[PDB]
Amino acid sequence: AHHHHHHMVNMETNETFALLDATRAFLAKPKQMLIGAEWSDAASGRQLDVVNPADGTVIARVPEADERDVQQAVAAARRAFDAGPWRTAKTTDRERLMLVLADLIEANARELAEIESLDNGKPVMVAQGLDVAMAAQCFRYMAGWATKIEGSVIDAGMPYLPDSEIFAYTRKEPVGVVGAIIPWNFPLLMAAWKIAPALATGCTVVLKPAEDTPLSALRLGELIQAAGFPDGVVNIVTGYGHTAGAALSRDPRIDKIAFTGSTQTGKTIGHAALDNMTRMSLELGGKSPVIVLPDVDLDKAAQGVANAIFFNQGQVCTAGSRAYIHSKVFDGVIERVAKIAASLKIGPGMDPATQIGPLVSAKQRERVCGYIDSGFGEGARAAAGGRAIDGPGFFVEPTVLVDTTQAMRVVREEIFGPVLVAMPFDDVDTAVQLANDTPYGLGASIWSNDLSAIHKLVPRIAAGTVWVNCHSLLDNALPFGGMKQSGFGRELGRAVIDQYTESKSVMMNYA
Amino acid sequence: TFALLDATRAFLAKPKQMLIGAEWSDAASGRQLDVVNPADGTVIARVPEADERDVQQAVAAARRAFDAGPWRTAKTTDRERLMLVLADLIEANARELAEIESLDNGKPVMVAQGLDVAMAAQCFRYMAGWATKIEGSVIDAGMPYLPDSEIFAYTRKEPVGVVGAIIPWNFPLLMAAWKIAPALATGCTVVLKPAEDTPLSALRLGELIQAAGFPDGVVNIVTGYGHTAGAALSRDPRIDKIAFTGSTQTGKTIGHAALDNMTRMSLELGGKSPVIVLPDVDLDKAAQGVANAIFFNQGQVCTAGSRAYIHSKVFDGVIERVAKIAASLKIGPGMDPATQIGPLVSAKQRERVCGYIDSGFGEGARAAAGGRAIDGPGFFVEPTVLVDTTQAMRVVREEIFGPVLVAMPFDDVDTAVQLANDTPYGLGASIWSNDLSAIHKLVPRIAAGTVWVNCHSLLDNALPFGGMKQSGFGRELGRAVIDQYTESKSVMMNYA
Ligand code: NA
Ligand code: NA
Known part of the structure; x- marks a missing residue:
């Protein structure tokens, strides 16, 4: 006989x-x-x-x-x-x-x-x-x-x-x-x-x-x-x-x-x-990095890393799409992040239970899944997620990839979906090198309660916004925008106001 | 020597x-x-x-x-x-x-x-x-x-x-x-x-x-x-x-x-910066101002006052005077302390500047002063004042970057504004007047990065300079330029 396949989809019993x-x-x-x-x-x-x-x-x-x-x-x-x-x-x-x-x-x-x-x-x-x-x-x-x-x-x-x-x-x-x-x-x-x-x-x-x-x-x-x-x-x-x-x-x-x-x-x-x-x-x-120092609370850090990528289905210019986590805590943080990812409720946005909606279009699902497939092809593996979900919406699983390297397409290129790449580092100089190893410079975060380490690190990361113990957090008073290939100019704050004006100098000789 | x-x-x-x-x-x-x-x-x-x-x-x-x-x-x-x-x-x-x-x-x-x-x-x-x-x-x-x-x-x-x-x-x-x-x-x-x-x-x-x-x-x-x-x-x-x-x-x-x-x-x-002269001016002061605005540095200035729009009540007296100033300027080597107008920078520049002048003559403009070639070594050109120009002519539309003025009358300030802004550029401009009301009504209407009053192309390190429109964007000098050589990084710490 020949194999006959049925994708299980019931739009008919689907809740409204x-x-x-x-x-x-x-x-x-x-x-x-x-x-x-x-x-x-x-x-x-x-x-x-x-x-x-x-x-x-x-x-x-x-x-x-x-x-x-x-x-x-x-x-x-x-x-x-x-x-x-x-x-x-x-x-x-x-x-x-x-x-x-x-x-x-x-x-x-x-x-x-x-x-x-x-x-x-x-x-x-x-x-x-x-x-x-x-x-x-x-x-x-x-x-x-x-x-x-x-x-x-x-x-x-x-x-x-x-x-x-x-x-x-x-x-x-x-x-x-x-x-x-x-x-x-x-x-x-x-x-x-x-x-x-x-x-x-x-x-x-x-x-x-x-x-x-x-x-x-x-x-x-x-x-x-x-x-x-x-x-x-x-x-x-x-x-x-x-x-x-x-x-x-x-x-x-x-x-x-x-x-x-x-x-x-x-x-x-x-x-x-x-x-x-x-x-x-x-x-x-953007391809914004998230740097986790070894002094963190493991659960706080894991929740922070998960939120940094999966917020708005990863469709965020400053999504925390690369996690660099100190080797002393990498296994514990990533284990926790994968559990969080697999627990997120995937569904229609109008359902109050939904934590992860669909992507915006079929084209976006095609792109995002193409990136995930590319990662697998280069030797990365999924600690969580990895596919498209059947049915007529444009849903994709929150996905966490490990065993990645800086050479891989999933690490170098913006995916613009709920896909994290996560890697260890042994010291802060290396974390800085990895974090800046991108053409982009839109955002970044540091997770730590170590004042000295935080203040030594903030100046070294080439990003327009550097968050500490948060990520992609906005306020109307705080300007936002890119360095490097992430563009130029600023949104929000006093800065944007000046950028919607043109300065005219006037000089009058009244002698 | x-x-x-x-x-x-x-x-x-x-x-x-x-x-x-x-x-x-x-x-x-x-x-x-x-x-x-x-x-x-x-x-x-x-x-x-x-x-x-x-x-x-x-x-x-x-x-x-x-x-x-x-x-x-x-x-x-x-x-x-x-x-x-x-x-x-x-x-x-x-x-x-x-x-x-x-x-x-x-x-x-x-x-x-x-x-x-x-x-x-x-x-x-x-x-x-x-x-x-x-x-x-x-x-x-x-x-x-x-x-x-x-x-x-x-x-x-x-x-x-x-x-x-x-x-x-x-x-x-x-x-x-x-x-x-x-x-x-x-x-x-x-x-x-x-x-x-x-x-x-x-x-x-x-x-x-x-x-x-x-x-x-x-x-x-x-x-x-x-x-x-x-x-x-x-x-x-x-x-x-x-x-x-x-x-x-x-x-x-x-x-x-x-x-x-x-x-x-x-x-x-x-740039193709306009100089607007209102009818209340002292005629000699205005003329000297119009002449300086264009002939400073042999007209080789991005903000040179290259278009003069002078109110019809005083146009003849101001331009008479400007032409006399132009013809009186001492042309010579820069090392001579008597020199008021040096040569242009190169033969290619002289060729360009003379080609513009020729173009003006070809389109019906006439020289109130200058125009004529200077023989001998060096890249010298006469200070030149062109009248009977119109807004369609190349000499009025295009940057010449030499000591060449075009000068035209206007009957009212609305017209002066239209004429002054009728350019792709927007680097500089000046207004010549002692009339507070007229000046303050006019300054906002001129689309230039710097508007001078009773002066032109005057600089100070504390006052930013730069273009609007096709004259570019960004600013030199002042506090403004400092901000333009920095990149802003926002930092947001959740210390909860
Ligand atoms: Na839509
Ligand atoms: Na030279």
Whole structure:
């Protein structure tokens, strides 16, 4: 006889979870882009599907914008900056409107979390308590900068000019029109990170959400209108990176491009920007190390290592994807991390029991599993996990690989999924060499309670953010961004505000 | 026969070499390029013509000096002390540096001494004082999603690392100082590539850097062509930052090379800066201001006031006066104290500048002053004022980088704003007026990185300088440049 195989899948007896009425209404109605004063379809009429990654089904459709639509959005943002009421708005007007928007996000937080969970796949509880809460706080925090942007008054020596009578100062002007392109891993939160500093400084914005996760950005557009922002201050265009995204990057009428994504796509974006002398901020790839010193509590360290990689299914630019653990405690820590990994509840994001959702798309599952297979092919072994899971969602097991070396693809390359590589080290100099042995430099963490060792180590790790006894932890007051091939520029804090302004020096001879 | 210091003569006579790590060296190829005195077209020196091999060696040295030498563990006060010593050494040898600069670049020696050299010294002194005053921030993190948080969070400012610096020929020593000083203050190391037309003052500065006591490899100086040595520096993945001043076109090429390695970049590029004259001005003061704004340094200034827009009520009187000033300026060798206008830097520059003038005539512009060729040795061009120009003409749209003004009337300030901003550039601009209300209404409307009032192209080490629009991005000088030679590292400790 011939072998006959049946993959056990019952979508039919699969459990369902209640949604708010508002969430259902938003999903049911026709979706459009926000272009100037109008909600609009694409000129072509084309649309793209929005897929729930828990079950592979289509939940919505959004416009598929081409260059024509992007050019219209840019034209609107230009007009709003060059001539509308936004141009003459008081600092206090911008502050007020942003504060209203932060409250509106909070008032509609569960709905936004459900939309985000359905579209992106992440656990709804995490979307609500982290993503949506911090999106709101980002608008509130930046609102307060709107009234506090200060230039400098300079006492110029003018050493070559006798009896000089010079009055000299700097002004911080909005950079202008900002094109913002964001990834799919934190759709609402990343939208907030790009839009909020723009609004606070008096910029206008064309936002291109990721093709895989357009919905929360569209709902945020509704809240922006409800908050009272003038038309064209925020415009939102949906579509493919290779068409809509690229067109935004090449438009000579933007003044700044703000991009988060892969290093490869970031370079493409930057080369387009440069040809127009467009300013650029680039938050790019990572392969962030987690260094565990031998003085740690083993359970705390293991929970820390597990969280550092598996948070948001490893779909985090600063995911702690390489663990270097001192040889005195390596076996105990890794044994514990594997047990944690195998215990994580895998399921749909709308189930409150779920700790690990699906990946965002089939393409992402294909990439991630391809990396895992590559590791096996080079001699790595799985202490936990290792496959794709059957069924129509895009699920992958939390995976921990050991017996890896620095030469392997899984160690060198960003996987962007729930895959850890873990290796021992015998001394701190070696841990430093291993940790910096990457083209990237986005994040890193150190796990220890040893003051001397921590302070000797922090300066030696080439990363934009170094955490101690935590990882991928955010606050609106603390800037975030890359060194090395992880890009340049900073999100959040006072820093981002300065990066959405252009400094004008003024020097008056009043003699 | 204008006299030179003995020291200047000795410097000119001896073999010139590049500074590469702990060695002064010739190029691996053995090639050299000529240094020409633009007042007479004669060769006064020869310097090495570096290729990629020599640039790679300089980058390797700078890397070693940042990654492992004494410079890595130097105290903030060590960097401060050495920079202050260097500033005094520049001042102690100021006349010699001025003579070298005048012979190599062509500018009046008195201006080289009183402006370029003095301000190069002051740049090192000013930036020395930043070395002990670079501060990160301590952040009180809300952590609103984390109850009872115990988070200690701050930023560190680290040196960006190894800096490649490529500079133009128009202010050779001063631009070297601008790129090198902030690097030293922050703890960076530097590979400097001076312009092929003006290598000499940079090489002499190298000697002063050594004499000041900087560790080997902290500053390296490679001479040669932009297309070879410059390009090699820009593409080296072992630099962390590229700092470039030059044309917008070359700036883009440099930036594309940088980007492929995710090298940070600062770019100070082209300009076509407008000078706006309001109708309340003193006519003589305005005319003298318009003339200085364009003819300073023979118009070889990125922020040269190359377009004058003068209110129609006073246009005729201001331009009459400007043309008289232009025709009166003393043209001659830079070493002559009577000289007000030196030659341009090279024959190729003169060809370019005269070609622009010719182009203007071809499109219907007329010369109120100058225009006519200067016979004889040296690369001399007359101070030139063109009128009857329009915004469509090449001379109005394109950077000429010589002593050529275009001047046009306007009837109202809205029009002056439209005209002034009708350029791809945005480096500088000036307004001439004593009318407080008009000035303050206008300053915000002009899209330029520096707006001067009743002056133009005036510099101070405390006031940042740089471009908007196609004039680049990033800033030189001030507190701003210091921050641009650091990389910020956020640190967040959970001490619970
Ligand atoms: Na989706
Ligand atoms: Na020369």
